[PDB]
């Protein structure tokens, strides 16, 4: 249908139904997180709080995943076993990560039903991230005591970060257990995150795919690629803002320093991916908790193999966490080369021209001479355009599927990004 009928239907056909369904599918999780937030303010024994959040986590996992939730429950139990047998070793991170790796690999070799496994990637990913994080924090000395069974269980089944929620440190969960007052900034954060979650859901389902023919008079492979990319980006921002809202509702997600408590849990930064400066910023602002996790527990350990091999190991861990699909594996393998080549080329350029064109904004005290010139702005905007081009080329895979589908989707675009980064790399090596 043309733009006339499209906008004649739009509101009552997509904007209200999608929002009503999005609310009807998360209202119970929100009610449970609010019940936990109100119950953790009564001054209960800590073990009773941990048991209550274990019960709430069971209820939420059952509500979202009817009976397959065992494949999460079991995992948690297994994790605690691996945490109890080596509670004295300094290897806790290594043992827990190897256990998680073997578990996810056996799951992705169809030892579990291929549709039962695909449904619970989001819960198993968070449980695995939390277990490996606790195992490494105990080694590095950032967590003092190995937790008791109820503390570990209440950590893995934290009702705020169990279904959609981001990864949170063990101490960032203990601080949520001890409870903070129900301020008004808390309610403002919850409300703004819920409103932005619904807004991104609406823009992902309705405005996303129908952008260029209807919302723009523009219209074609690249336009379809870009609208698929933005629909994927906003479908991600929906889950990001919803996890932020459901973790700030349950009490977690805050930082306090010198008698000042601020609810500043940010999972995604949409303006750093829609108006990007470089692909490094895109990768690190797509998911901030996951970027911190992957940099702290996979990169800082695999860094012995060299910087590039460590980047490859980090992106392989990211592809394994997110579930091994061929389109996602190809995207996360192209992202390694893209971000590395762009970072090192911008590095050599900012060293040669002495301009502040580094893949991230330079701090106020830097050697670069030309900082706010218009040539620097032109170069930064050219690299932002290259980042948008890479984003479209990579997000064209998520049109709404193994090697054939990805090679087909990327062959229509003439493999443009994989030649652009090759050209950037040979340009890096020429000016070397």
């Amino acid at each position: 249908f043309s733009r006339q009928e499209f906008f004649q239907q739009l509101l009552q056909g997509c904007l209200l139904p999608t929002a009503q369904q999005g609310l009807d599918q998360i209202w119970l999780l929100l009610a449970i997180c609010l019940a936990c937030r109100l119950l953790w303010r009564l001054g209960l024994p800590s073990y009773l709080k941990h048991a209550s959040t274990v019960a709430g986590g069971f209820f939420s996992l059952y509500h979202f995943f009817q009976l397959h939730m065992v494949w999460v429950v079991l995992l948690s139990l297994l994790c605690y076993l691996v945490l109890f047998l080596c509670r004295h070793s300094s290897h806790r991170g290594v043992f827990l990560s190897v256990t998680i790796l073997i578990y996810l690999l056996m799951g992705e070799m169809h030892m579990v039903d291929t549709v039962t496994w695909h449904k619970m990637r989001g819960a198993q990913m968070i449980v695995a991230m939390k277990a490996v994080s606790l195992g490494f924090d105990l080694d590095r000395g950032e967590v003092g005591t190995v937790p008791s069974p109820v503390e570990f269980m209440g950590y893995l089944y934290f009702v705020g970060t169990i279904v959609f929620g981001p990864w949170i440190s063990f101490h960032s969960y203990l601080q949520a257990v001890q409870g903070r007052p129900l301020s008004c900034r808390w309610l403002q954060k919850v409300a703004r995150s819920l409103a932005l979650a619904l807004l991104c859901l609406v823009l992902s389902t309705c405005v996303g795919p129908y952008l260029f023919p209807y919302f723009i008079p523009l219209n074609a492979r690249w336009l379809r690629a870009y609208e698929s990319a933005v629909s994927f980006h906003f479908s991600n921002y929906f889950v990001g803002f919803l996890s932020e809202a459901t973790a700030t509702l349950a009490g977690a997600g805050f930082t306090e320093e010198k008698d000042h408590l601020e609810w500043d849990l940010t999972v995604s930064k949409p303006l750093n991916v829609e108006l990007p400066r470089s692909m490094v910023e895109v990768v690190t602002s797509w998911n901030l908790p996951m970027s911190y996790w992957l940099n702290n527990y996979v990169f800082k350990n695999a860094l012995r193999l060299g910087t590039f091999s460590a980047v490859l190991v980090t992106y392989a861990a990211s592809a394994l966490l997110h579930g091994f699909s061929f389109h996602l594996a190809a995207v996360l393998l192209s992202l390694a080369f893209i971000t590395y080549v762009e970072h090192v080329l911008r590095k050599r350029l900012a060293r040669i021209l002495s301009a502040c064109v580094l893949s991230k904004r330079c701090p106020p005290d830097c050697s670069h001479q030309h900082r706010l010139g218009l040539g620097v702005r032109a170069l930064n905007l050219l690299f932002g355009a290259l980042a948008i081009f890479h984003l479209a080329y990579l997000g064209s895979l998520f049109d709404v599927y193994g090697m054939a589908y990805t090679v087909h989707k990327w062959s229509e675009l003439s493999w443009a990004s994989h030649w652009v980064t090759f050209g950037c790399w040979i340009f890096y090596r020429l000016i070397g």
Binding site: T18, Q21, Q25, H118, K119, G122, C206, H322
Partner: peptide
């Protein structure tokens, strides 16, 4: 002629929204 979209963590249909 309704189409359904899946929103969730790493695929993982957890919020399905359909519309004509």
């Amino acid at each position: 002629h309704l189409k359904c979209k899946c929103h969730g963590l790493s695929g993982s249909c957890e919020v399905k929204t359909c519309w004509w």
